Amino acid sequence: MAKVRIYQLAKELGMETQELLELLDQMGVAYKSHASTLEEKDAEAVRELVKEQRGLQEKLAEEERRKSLPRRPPVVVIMGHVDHGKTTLLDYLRKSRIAEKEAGGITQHVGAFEVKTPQGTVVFIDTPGHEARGAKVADIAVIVIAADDGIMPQTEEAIAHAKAAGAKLIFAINKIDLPQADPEKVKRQLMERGFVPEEYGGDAIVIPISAKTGQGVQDLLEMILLLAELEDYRADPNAEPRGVILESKLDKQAGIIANMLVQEGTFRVGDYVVAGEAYGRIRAMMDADGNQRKEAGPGSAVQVLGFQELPHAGDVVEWVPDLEAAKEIAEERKEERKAREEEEKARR
Ligand SMILES: Nc1nc2c(ncn2[C@@H]2O[C@H](COP(=O)(O)OP(=O)(O)OP(=O)(O)O)[C@@H](O)[C@H]2O)c(=O)[nH]1
Numbered sequence: 001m002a003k004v005r006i007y008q009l010a011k012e013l014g015m016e017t018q019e020l021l022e023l024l025d026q027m028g029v030a031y032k033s034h035a036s037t038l039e040e041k042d043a044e045a046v047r048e049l050v051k052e053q054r055g056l057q058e059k060l061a062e063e064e065r066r067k068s069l070p071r072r073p074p075v076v077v078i079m080g081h082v083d084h085g086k087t088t089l090l091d092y093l094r095k096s097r098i099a100e101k102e103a104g105g106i107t108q109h110v111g112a113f114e115v116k117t118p119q120g121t122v123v124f125i126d127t128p129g130h131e132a133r134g135a136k137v138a139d140i141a142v143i144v145i146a147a148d149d150g151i152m153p154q155t156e157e158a159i160a161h162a163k164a165a166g167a168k169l170i171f172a173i174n175k176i177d178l179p180q181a182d183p184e185k186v187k188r189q190l191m192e193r194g195f196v197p198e199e200y201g202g203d204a205i206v207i208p209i210s211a212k213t214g215q216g217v218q219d220l221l222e223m224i225l226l227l228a229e230l231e232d233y234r235a236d237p238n239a240e241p242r243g244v245i246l247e248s249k250l251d252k253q254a255g256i257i258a259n260m261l262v263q264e265g266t267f268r269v270g271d272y273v274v275a276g277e278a279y280g281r282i283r284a285m286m287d288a289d290g291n292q293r294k295e296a297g298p299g300s301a302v303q304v305l306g307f308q309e310l311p312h313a314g315d316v317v318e319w320v321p322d323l324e325a326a327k328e329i330a331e332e333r334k335e336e337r338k339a340r341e342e343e344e345k346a347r348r
């Protein structure tokens with residue numbers, strides 16, 4: 001130092017000889033060999049210019065990986081005709097989820113539950129129902145058909161709903177344990193309706209299963225996760241929090257509560273949110289496993305406390321910066337709802 005030789009400075013910077021010589025050439029600093037001596041002006045300039053380029057590349061790298069978003073579990077709705085085994089399938093799926101013991105894990109109903117597999121986690125919507133807009137909830141819809149019954153128009157219509165809901169269809173032929181079961185009949189029904197099973201070279205997905213047995217139900221999961229990978233579901237935990245109201249109700253010893261599914265961003269306790277005209281602050285959050293949750297990320301379905309009113313199902317839960325923002329946004333929707341219902345006076 002004062003003055004330093006190039007081979008010494010290179011050892012300081014953990015740098016290769018030719019690397020530093022290349023760099024010096026760029027800078028316009030003349031030398032002879034790496035044995036040559038550097039002026040302190042040049043040396044300090046090198047020390048600094050090395051810092052820039054290094055930090056910059058780490059900056060370029062860090063901002064490159066964040067460009068790639070974390071994945072999210074698939075959200076799955078189960079549908080079908082009455083008696084076709086919908087509920088039993090749902091109920092079974094719960095039972096397979098804790099294969100261990102009580103509890104622990106109060107297993108409270110947050111409007112959805114998660115089935116964790118060695119492949120990955122699947123989010124199943126658990127709530128009514130028959131289904132009788134709103135915001136997109138399920139990525140995947142599972143259309144259940146009894147093998148001993150087959151395709152009713154009810155099933156046909158539950159199919160067209162999921163297509164209007166933008167959900168990828170998965171057909172499950174159920175009750176295959178019955179002697180009067182006819183899975184082939186159902187395939188022909190699906191085909192004549194324009195859904196061609198993969199085995200026949202079409203894009204339709206058909207998994208035979210028994211909600212009674214548990215037979216092939218494992219296959220159904222692997223396929224969901226499979227199609228999930230095909231669709232590559234992902235969400236940004238850092239975006240402005242966005243979610244959807246599954247169900248909202250009243251526990252008299254509690255008061256207004258809401259079951260919410262998180263889609264984008266991360267909700268936290270203390271956040272102000274507005275769902276439709278409903279709003280409030282988040283006092284607490286509780287998951288399917290019962291834990292009191294500080295934060296909720298995409299795929300998380302949680303119990304929410306602190307809404308002022310009961311929010312409508314399927315409404316979008318959206319983060320807001322403060323209480324005054326919640327009021328104004330929620331109120332503005334009320335005015336239009338009110339006044340446009342007086343547009344519903346005449347003549348409609
Ligand atoms: N043999 C057989 N019976 C089943 C199977 N799955 C469901 N069931 C029977 O189907 C009957 C009613 O179907 P659920 O499982 O309750 O489905 P669900 O509640 O009727 O569905 P929705 O009426 O549309 O609400 C029950 O008696 C079940 O025992 C199955 O995989 N095999």
Ligand SMILES: [Mg+2]
Nearest residue numbers: 082083086087
């Ligand atoms: Mg039922």
